């Protein structure tokens, strides 16, 4: 029973399991069936940027995805995350391919967590930033088909020598250190995440997508969670 | 006239202008009559901390004030600030006394602003932090009775040689540089503010309060804005 | 008479004023005749990056300029800057051309200053970052030929309509707010600066260079400081 | 055999292994016999602060230790750390007692590291800050006697229920995630570290001290490294 909170860049509409009929960004609370979605125009071969924002005061998880184009999709969801997540978590990126496929290439990833207590001027904080991924990235936990180093990029799902994506692939990268996501005595608990991605496909349809996620610290890829399950959920319920 | 967005720590109930009948924190949008308030237990002689948070994605302005004993008050309000504030602003702190009085001592003040544009990896950012103020604080514009240096603090309103606060006082401190609070090509426009404060009084009722505010770059203390107007507004409409 | 400390990216050797006979980077303390230089291979048309570092403990002003190549040049100079600079300063970038010319385009600029006092914790900080420059950049003070907005860049020296640089040009940009660069009570005072630049020329000899500098707050371009004087110094003493 | 770089706050002069005949701060490169020391007027039972700065461009490691009254000791040493440390390291704090003893209490600890490659605008960074340590601090690896939670502090060496230090104790805390401290392509590989500590003793002479250190990721407490070896070294060579 892993616990997952995620923001999904979902490139392939699985209408049989509640996806909207178009590519979309979604906020997933413990389920692949997003609590909230917004229409997303995925630009093939373009570098996209995703921003994830949350604070325990406003209690609103917000995401926005944009392209140099200026086009962007935004989704927000009201939720008290310390009611959902355990006190300590790991943070990661996940992606899959299914019958259809795409590259799930991460060019950068940054994260910041802060816990500001009632004790005057006392903050715990964690911040990391990857603008380059080397072949042996020791501060990343790689699961499934994820690899690092290729062009200083992070490839979440399987890519061939020529740079062609493979189907039925799943990969995740988690930051090595546990993250203290909330604390009972913190007046403000907040976090921000940003990553840049390149999704390209020669298919009639790209699949299946990329997600930023927060999980219990021992989280691993659920069995058979390629394709529509985005490497996050054990079932589609 | 000035355009003001503010978070007020209001120590004195002026019920005839919409104040609730108790000390309170409020979010002010272009008026002294808060769009949203919350009951605040002001702790005389104790050091309090205010946190203000906003991002352009969730479009929710939040503030929490707390003391070391864990007592706190929180208020949130949904608003798109790019429809309220001009593109360039100055940020500041303001405080007043009236018939009744209190010290309006600031012990620290920090602010962070970020404009993340659609251009990949293109962020503009401003951040400052004061944990002490000196007698000649050149990066602060002091207006009214505000002074710096007294015990490394910032005294917003007038205080006598022995520490006794004066009545009918108003003072403000604004950060020297203009701040680019929003932009059209910005996918994210967030800001955070924090300050710590010491409000003490020997009156039966302390007055009138402290506020963090955001105004047009040429903002000045409106005529007659002492006491209940918190040095921010020309009138109580 | 201004007080100037600067790191020069000197593209044109003026041997009659103490320059080495090759393009170079140098540390200038109150004089255009560098206290220290190192040979620098400027790459026409490439985006370069300059990093400037200093702290009041090691007391070594250090600079490094690099290209994606990545060839790079480094220069360091042992000096106590709080013996040179005034307590409050402004920071800026400057560039010139003379009989020979080049573009002096700034693509980004960030700066961080910190004063850490003896009082446990208690830090004063200032940080800004520009990754794009709009036509009306209110938090910059532009001097001479300097303009902002052209492709979201900062052009320090004159550029014709077609993108060709003009000769005998001088321009500077300074951050709007005064910076508290040293303080007597501070145990650690440090600053860090970064900028990316694009110098391109069609001349047989590109000239004259770019500099990051720290000066007295009311610093302006000295008369006749184009070309070899880099807009920083009134003469070559 | 571990590789150690360290800044020691040495409270007990072990003159037989090269210690100066007074409490001192030192920079240790692979040896308990400091490459550089400075006299340190240690203040029993007072809260002190250590700042550590590595300037990778200047190749200069510096440390300053101070108390609220302003008294400070400083030490600098020239070294290029990519010649000493492996590419990946862990960072941590260490402390010991021997025949003589002292509390080795850590009240706060922050660390910031930055690898800036030659690829334009590509910076990897890690930052963490602890202003309080909980009883279950999942992002720290505790070794030997080190414990967390007591008054929100980190106790590196054994302390009794009534706050009295024990002799012949050794304990270390390492940040969980491996740190990429240098890389071939990196033009800048600097870091800063800060911690606040409380050393108290009823002994005539407190011993043995506290160190901030950097080591190979699999570093553990060397056999019989209590007392003068500060839990860092296997012997006094
Ligand atoms: C209806 O079932 C068929 O078609 C499905 C596609 O709609 C296909 O789903 C696979 O591929 C999709 C896209 O990659 C992925 O989302 C699913 O998880 C699954 O792997 C079915 O396999 C059938 O062909
Ligand atoms: C008509 O109200 C009388 O009493 C008021 C106080 O309740 C007083 O208000 C003054 O003082 C308050 C508190 O300092 C301040 O909020 C007002 O703006 C004003 O300065 C009125 O003046 C009357 O005496
Ligand atoms: C006397 O030297 C002659 O040639 C010099 C270099 O061509 C020239 O210097 C001008 O241009 C250089 C390079 O742009 C600049 O550094 C000087 O400040 C000056 O403007 C002299 O003027 C002579 O022509
Ligand atoms: C000379 O050797 C004796 O005295 C030594 C120090 O006085 C003592 O060293 C022990 O205690 C010190 C201080 O705690 C510590 O630095 C050593 O590592 C060792 O633990 C010797 O044991 C002798 O008594
Ligand atoms: Ca889907
Ligand atoms: Ca009021
Ligand atoms: Ca020259
Ligand atoms: Ca010793
Ligand atoms: Cl240094
Ligand atoms: Cl060396
Ligand atoms: Mn979906
Ligand atoms: Mn009110
Ligand atoms: Mn020169
Ligand atoms: Mn020693």
PDB file of N, CA, C and O in Angstrom, chain C residues 47 51 53 55 57-58 60 62-64 66-68 70 74 76 108 116 118 120-121 131 187-188 192 196, chain D residues 47 49 51 53 55 57-58 60 62-64 66-68 70 76 78 108 116 118 120-121 131 187-188 196:
ATOM      1  N   UNK C  47      28.228  31.994 -26.559  1.00  0.00           N
ATOM      2  CA  UNK C  47      27.753  32.455 -25.261  1.00  0.00           C
ATOM      3  C   UNK C  47      28.737  32.055 -24.167  1.00  0.00           C
ATOM      4  O   UNK C  47      28.933  30.866 -23.896  1.00  0.00           O
ATOM      5  N   UNK C  51      32.013  33.925 -13.797  1.00  0.00           N
ATOM      6  CA  UNK C  51      31.671  33.758 -12.388  1.00  0.00           C
ATOM      7  C   UNK C  51      32.623  34.571 -11.528  1.00  0.00           C
ATOM      8  O   UNK C  51      33.838  34.431 -11.656  1.00  0.00           O
ATOM      9  N   UNK C  53      33.629  35.598  -7.491  1.00  0.00           N
ATOM     10  CA  UNK C  53      33.461  35.157  -6.111  1.00  0.00           C
ATOM     11  C   UNK C  53      34.345  35.925  -5.138  1.00  0.00           C
ATOM     12  O   UNK C  53      35.501  36.221  -5.437  1.00  0.00           O
ATOM     13  N   UNK C  55      34.834  36.418  -0.529  1.00  0.00           N
ATOM     14  CA  UNK C  55      34.400  36.407   0.864  1.00  0.00           C
ATOM     15  C   UNK C  55      35.476  37.016   1.759  1.00  0.00           C
ATOM     16  O   UNK C  55      36.660  36.973   1.426  1.00  0.00           O
ATOM     17  N   UNK C  57      36.796  36.252   4.531  1.00  0.00           N
ATOM     18  CA  UNK C  57      37.637  35.393   5.353  1.00  0.00           C
ATOM     19  C   UNK C  57      38.878  35.008   4.573  1.00  0.00           C
ATOM     20  O   UNK C  57      39.993  35.253   5.016  1.00  0.00           O
ATOM     21  N   UNK C  58      38.672  34.410   3.404  1.00  0.00           N
ATOM     22  CA  UNK C  58      39.768  34.055   2.524  1.00  0.00           C
ATOM     23  C   UNK C  58      40.367  35.272   1.844  1.00  0.00           C
ATOM     24  O   UNK C  58      41.531  35.252   1.454  1.00  0.00           O
ATOM     25  N   UNK C  60      40.078  36.630  -1.121  1.00  0.00           N
ATOM     26  CA  UNK C  60      40.622  36.398  -2.446  1.00  0.00           C
ATOM     27  C   UNK C  60      39.544  36.608  -3.491  1.00  0.00           C
ATOM     28  O   UNK C  60      38.647  35.782  -3.646  1.00  0.00           O
ATOM     29  N   UNK C  62      38.074  36.172  -6.767  1.00  0.00           N
ATOM     30  CA  UNK C  62      38.321  35.155  -7.783  1.00  0.00           C
ATOM     31  C   UNK C  62      37.318  35.251  -8.923  1.00  0.00           C
ATOM     32  O   UNK C  62      36.141  35.531  -8.704  1.00  0.00           O
ATOM     33  N   UNK C  63      37.791  35.013 -10.139  1.00  0.00           N
ATOM     34  CA  UNK C  63      36.940  35.078 -11.317  1.00  0.00           C
ATOM     35  C   UNK C  63      37.297  33.959 -12.287  1.00  0.00           C
ATOM     36  O   UNK C  63      38.454  33.558 -12.383  1.00  0.00           O
ATOM     37  N   UNK C  64      36.296  33.453 -12.997  1.00  0.00           N
ATOM     38  CA  UNK C  64      36.520  32.460 -14.034  1.00  0.00           C
ATOM     39  C   UNK C  64      35.550  32.702 -15.186  1.00  0.00           C
ATOM     40  O   UNK C  64      34.359  32.940 -14.972  1.00  0.00           O
ATOM     41  N   UNK C  66      34.249  31.041 -18.888  1.00  0.00           N
ATOM     42  CA  UNK C  66      34.266  29.790 -19.625  1.00  0.00           C
ATOM     43  C   UNK C  66      33.286  29.793 -20.782  1.00  0.00           C
ATOM     44  O   UNK C  66      32.349  30.590 -20.816  1.00  0.00           O
ATOM     45  N   UNK C  67      33.521  28.889 -21.729  1.00  0.00           N
ATOM     46  CA  UNK C  67      32.605  28.647 -22.836  1.00  0.00           C
ATOM     47  C   UNK C  67      32.182  27.183 -22.801  1.00  0.00           C
ATOM     48  O   UNK C  67      32.815  26.375 -22.127  1.00  0.00           O
ATOM     49  N   UNK C  68      31.103  26.840 -23.516  1.00  0.00           N
ATOM     50  CA  UNK C  68      30.634  25.450 -23.587  1.00  0.00           C
ATOM     51  C   UNK C  68      31.710  24.504 -24.121  1.00  0.00           C
ATOM     52  O   UNK C  68      31.612  23.293 -23.938  1.00  0.00           O
ATOM     53  N   UNK C  70      34.643  23.039 -23.401  1.00  0.00           N
ATOM     54  CA  UNK C  70      34.679  24.250 -22.608  1.00  0.00           C
ATOM     55  C   UNK C  70      36.071  24.679 -22.176  1.00  0.00           C
ATOM     56  O   UNK C  70      36.602  24.194 -21.175  1.00  0.00           O
ATOM     57  N   UNK C  74      40.989  31.629 -15.580  1.00  0.00           N
ATOM     58  CA  UNK C  74      40.762  31.933 -14.171  1.00  0.00           C
ATOM     59  C   UNK C  74      41.781  32.943 -13.665  1.00  0.00           C
ATOM     60  O   UNK C  74      42.953  32.892 -14.029  1.00  0.00           O
ATOM     61  N   UNK C  76      42.799  35.261  -9.903  1.00  0.00           N
ATOM     62  CA  UNK C  76      42.558  35.503  -8.481  1.00  0.00           C
ATOM     63  C   UNK C  76      43.501  36.572  -7.941  1.00  0.00           C
ATOM     64  O   UNK C  76      44.629  36.714  -8.406  1.00  0.00           O
ATOM     65  N   UNK C 108      22.222  37.265 -19.336  1.00  0.00           N
ATOM     66  CA  UNK C 108      21.740  37.084 -17.976  1.00  0.00           C
ATOM     67  C   UNK C 108      22.746  37.647 -16.980  1.00  0.00           C
ATOM     68  O   UNK C 108      23.918  37.832 -17.305  1.00  0.00           O
ATOM     69  N   UNK C 116      26.858  38.132   7.491  1.00  0.00           N
ATOM     70  CA  UNK C 116      26.515  37.283   8.626  1.00  0.00           C
ATOM     71  C   UNK C 116      27.151  37.841   9.891  1.00  0.00           C
ATOM     72  O   UNK C 116      28.373  37.916  10.001  1.00  0.00           O
ATOM     73  N   UNK C 118      27.847  38.477  14.172  1.00  0.00           N
ATOM     74  CA  UNK C 118      28.223  37.701  15.347  1.00  0.00           C
ATOM     75  C   UNK C 118      26.994  37.185  16.086  1.00  0.00           C
ATOM     76  O   UNK C 118      27.010  36.092  16.657  1.00  0.00           O
ATOM     77  N   UNK C 120      24.129  35.238  16.881  1.00  0.00           N
ATOM     78  CA  UNK C 120      23.821  33.895  16.392  1.00  0.00           C
ATOM     79  C   UNK C 120      22.759  33.925  15.299  1.00  0.00           C
ATOM     80  O   UNK C 120      21.669  34.477  15.485  1.00  0.00           O
ATOM     81  N   UNK C 121      23.098  33.328  14.158  1.00  0.00           N
ATOM     82  CA  UNK C 121      22.302  33.455  12.943  1.00  0.00           C
ATOM     83  C   UNK C 121      22.320  34.907  12.467  1.00  0.00           C
ATOM     84  O   UNK C 121      23.390  35.457  12.187  1.00  0.00           O
ATOM     85  N   UNK C 131      17.242  36.831 -16.142  1.00  0.00           N
ATOM     86  CA  UNK C 131      17.443  35.932 -17.270  1.00  0.00           C
ATOM     87  C   UNK C 131      16.833  36.524 -18.529  1.00  0.00           C
ATOM     88  O   UNK C 131      16.998  35.991 -19.619  1.00  0.00           O
ATOM     89  N   UNK C 187      30.924  38.902  10.816  1.00  0.00           N
ATOM     90  CA  UNK C 187      31.989  37.902  10.864  1.00  0.00           C
ATOM     91  C   UNK C 187      32.326  37.403   9.460  1.00  0.00           C
ATOM     92  O   UNK C 187      33.482  37.133   9.146  1.00  0.00           O
ATOM     93  N   UNK C 188      31.303  37.280   8.622  1.00  0.00           N
ATOM     94  CA  UNK C 188      31.497  36.900   7.233  1.00  0.00           C
ATOM     95  C   UNK C 188      30.716  37.824   6.311  1.00  0.00           C
ATOM     96  O   UNK C 188      29.515  38.028   6.487  1.00  0.00           O
ATOM     97  N   UNK C 192      28.811  37.087  -4.699  1.00  0.00           N
ATOM     98  CA  UNK C 192      28.970  36.168  -5.803  1.00  0.00           C
ATOM     99  C   UNK C 192      28.210  36.785  -6.968  1.00  0.00           C
ATOM    100  O   UNK C 192      27.096  37.273  -6.799  1.00  0.00           O
ATOM    101  N   UNK C 196      26.118  35.848 -18.272  1.00  0.00           N
ATOM    102  CA  UNK C 196      26.413  35.224 -19.544  1.00  0.00           C
ATOM    103  C   UNK C 196      26.444  36.326 -20.577  1.00  0.00           C
ATOM    104  O   UNK C 196      25.637  37.255 -20.535  1.00  0.00           O
TER     105      UNK C 196
ATOM    106  N   UNK D  47      27.174  29.612  23.277  1.00  0.00           N
ATOM    107  CA  UNK D  47      26.850  29.134  21.938  1.00  0.00           C
ATOM    108  C   UNK D  47      27.749  29.792  20.898  1.00  0.00           C
ATOM    109  O   UNK D  47      27.784  31.013  20.781  1.00  0.00           O
ATOM    110  N   UNK D  49      29.386  29.769  16.704  1.00  0.00           N
ATOM    111  CA  UNK D  49      29.023  29.519  15.317  1.00  0.00           C
ATOM    112  C   UNK D  49      30.272  29.313  14.476  1.00  0.00           C
ATOM    113  O   UNK D  49      31.212  30.099  14.553  1.00  0.00           O
ATOM    114  N   UNK D  51      31.575  28.997  10.511  1.00  0.00           N
ATOM    115  CA  UNK D  51      31.292  29.153   9.091  1.00  0.00           C
ATOM    116  C   UNK D  51      32.453  28.557   8.315  1.00  0.00           C
ATOM    117  O   UNK D  51      33.610  28.848   8.604  1.00  0.00           O
ATOM    118  N   UNK D  53      33.913  27.918   4.335  1.00  0.00           N
ATOM    119  CA  UNK D  53      33.756  28.321   2.947  1.00  0.00           C
ATOM    120  C   UNK D  53      34.830  27.720   2.057  1.00  0.00           C
ATOM    121  O   UNK D  53      36.026  27.871   2.303  1.00  0.00           O
ATOM    122  N   UNK D  55      36.117  28.132  -1.637  1.00  0.00           N
ATOM    123  CA  UNK D  55      36.148  28.847  -2.898  1.00  0.00           C
ATOM    124  C   UNK D  55      36.947  28.005  -3.885  1.00  0.00           C
ATOM    125  O   UNK D  55      38.172  27.933  -3.797  1.00  0.00           O
ATOM    126  N   UNK D  57      37.238  28.345  -7.202  1.00  0.00           N
ATOM    127  CA  UNK D  57      37.941  29.126  -8.213  1.00  0.00           C
ATOM    128  C   UNK D  57      39.290  29.586  -7.663  1.00  0.00           C
ATOM    129  O   UNK D  57      40.318  29.439  -8.317  1.00  0.00           O
ATOM    130  N   UNK D  58      39.277  30.127  -6.448  1.00  0.00           N
ATOM    131  CA  UNK D  58      40.499  30.542  -5.783  1.00  0.00           C
ATOM    132  C   UNK D  58      41.264  29.391  -5.147  1.00  0.00           C
ATOM    133  O   UNK D  58      42.414  29.560  -4.760  1.00  0.00           O
ATOM    134  N   UNK D  60      40.672  27.793  -2.181  1.00  0.00           N
ATOM    135  CA  UNK D  60      40.971  28.273  -0.839  1.00  0.00           C
ATOM    136  C   UNK D  60      39.869  27.865   0.134  1.00  0.00           C
ATOM    137  O   UNK D  60      38.711  28.234  -0.039  1.00  0.00           O
ATOM    138  N   UNK D  62      38.403  28.102   3.878  1.00  0.00           N
ATOM    139  CA  UNK D  62      38.447  28.991   5.034  1.00  0.00           C
ATOM    140  C   UNK D  62      37.395  28.624   6.067  1.00  0.00           C
ATOM    141  O   UNK D  62      36.344  28.065   5.746  1.00  0.00           O
ATOM    142  N   UNK D  63      37.690  28.955   7.316  1.00  0.00           N
ATOM    143  CA  UNK D  63      36.766  28.734   8.407  1.00  0.00           C
ATOM    144  C   UNK D  63      36.887  29.875   9.408  1.00  0.00           C
ATOM    145  O   UNK D  63      37.978  30.384   9.653  1.00  0.00           O
ATOM    146  N   UNK D  64      35.754  30.285   9.963  1.00  0.00           N
ATOM    147  CA  UNK D  64      35.739  31.232  11.060  1.00  0.00           C
ATOM    148  C   UNK D  64      34.813  30.700  12.147  1.00  0.00           C
ATOM    149  O   UNK D  64      33.728  30.186  11.858  1.00  0.00           O
ATOM    150  N   UNK D  66      33.072  31.909  15.847  1.00  0.00           N
ATOM    151  CA  UNK D  66      32.821  33.105  16.639  1.00  0.00           C
ATOM    152  C   UNK D  66      31.734  32.921  17.694  1.00  0.00           C
ATOM    153  O   UNK D  66      30.943  31.979  17.634  1.00  0.00           O
ATOM    154  N   UNK D  67      31.717  33.841  18.658  1.00  0.00           N
ATOM    155  CA  UNK D  67      30.667  33.929  19.663  1.00  0.00           C
ATOM    156  C   UNK D  67      29.934  35.256  19.517  1.00  0.00           C
ATOM    157  O   UNK D  67      30.420  36.160  18.841  1.00  0.00           O
ATOM    158  N   UNK D  68      28.757  35.375  20.149  1.00  0.00           N
ATOM    159  CA  UNK D  68      27.942  36.595  20.079  1.00  0.00           C
ATOM    160  C   UNK D  68      28.687  37.870  20.487  1.00  0.00           C
ATOM    161  O   UNK D  68      28.357  38.942  19.984  1.00  0.00           O
ATOM    162  N   UNK D  70      31.484  38.716  19.620  1.00  0.00           N
ATOM    163  CA  UNK D  70      32.287  39.145  18.491  1.00  0.00           C
ATOM    164  C   UNK D  70      33.638  38.463  18.374  1.00  0.00           C
ATOM    165  O   UNK D  70      34.235  38.457  17.298  1.00  0.00           O
ATOM    166  N   UNK D  76      42.650  29.983   7.101  1.00  0.00           N
ATOM    167  CA  UNK D  76      42.520  29.735   5.667  1.00  0.00           C
ATOM    168  C   UNK D  76      43.649  28.848   5.172  1.00  0.00           C
ATOM    169  O   UNK D  76      44.768  28.916   5.669  1.00  0.00           O
ATOM    170  N   UNK D  78      45.242  26.992   1.366  1.00  0.00           N
ATOM    171  CA  UNK D  78      45.154  26.795  -0.074  1.00  0.00           C
ATOM    172  C   UNK D  78      45.163  25.318  -0.427  1.00  0.00           C
ATOM    173  O   UNK D  78      46.091  24.583  -0.078  1.00  0.00           O
ATOM    174  N   UNK D 108      22.292  23.766  15.191  1.00  0.00           N
ATOM    175  CA  UNK D 108      21.885  23.971  13.807  1.00  0.00           C
ATOM    176  C   UNK D 108      23.021  23.649  12.854  1.00  0.00           C
ATOM    177  O   UNK D 108      24.189  23.714  13.220  1.00  0.00           O
ATOM    178  N   UNK D 116      28.938  23.959 -11.098  1.00  0.00           N
ATOM    179  CA  UNK D 116      28.541  24.700 -12.286  1.00  0.00           C
ATOM    180  C   UNK D 116      29.384  24.229 -13.463  1.00  0.00           C
ATOM    181  O   UNK D 116      30.586  24.474 -13.506  1.00  0.00           O
ATOM    182  N   UNK D 118      30.429  23.773 -17.662  1.00  0.00           N
ATOM    183  CA  UNK D 118      30.700  24.703 -18.755  1.00  0.00           C
ATOM    184  C   UNK D 118      29.517  24.840 -19.709  1.00  0.00           C
ATOM    185  O   UNK D 118      29.469  25.760 -20.526  1.00  0.00           O
ATOM    186  N   UNK D 120      26.263  26.178 -20.634  1.00  0.00           N
ATOM    187  CA  UNK D 120      25.581  27.405 -20.229  1.00  0.00           C
ATOM    188  C   UNK D 120      24.352  27.156 -19.357  1.00  0.00           C
ATOM    189  O   UNK D 120      23.513  26.311 -19.676  1.00  0.00           O
ATOM    190  N   UNK D 121      24.258  27.899 -18.257  1.00  0.00           N
ATOM    191  CA  UNK D 121      23.111  27.823 -17.355  1.00  0.00           C
ATOM    192  C   UNK D 121      22.799  26.402 -16.908  1.00  0.00           C
ATOM    193  O   UNK D 121      21.635  26.017 -16.788  1.00  0.00           O
ATOM    194  N   UNK D 131      17.492  23.537  11.651  1.00  0.00           N
ATOM    195  CA  UNK D 131      17.463  24.410  12.820  1.00  0.00           C
ATOM    196  C   UNK D 131      16.887  23.654  14.003  1.00  0.00           C
ATOM    197  O   UNK D 131      16.855  24.154  15.123  1.00  0.00           O
ATOM    198  N   UNK D 187      33.368  24.127 -13.867  1.00  0.00           N
ATOM    199  CA  UNK D 187      34.204  25.325 -13.773  1.00  0.00           C
ATOM    200  C   UNK D 187      34.165  25.915 -12.360  1.00  0.00           C
ATOM    201  O   UNK D 187      35.072  26.641 -11.955  1.00  0.00           O
ATOM    202  N   UNK D 188      33.103  25.596 -11.622  1.00  0.00           N
ATOM    203  CA  UNK D 188      32.981  25.981 -10.220  1.00  0.00           C
ATOM    204  C   UNK D 188      32.459  24.799  -9.403  1.00  0.00           C
ATOM    205  O   UNK D 188      31.482  24.156  -9.787  1.00  0.00           O
ATOM    206  N   UNK D 196      26.052  25.699  14.501  1.00  0.00           N
ATOM    207  CA  UNK D 196      26.130  26.315  15.811  1.00  0.00           C
ATOM    208  C   UNK D 196      26.229  25.195  16.841  1.00  0.00           C
ATOM    209  O   UNK D 196      25.614  24.138  16.694  1.00  0.00           O
TER     210      UNK D 196
END
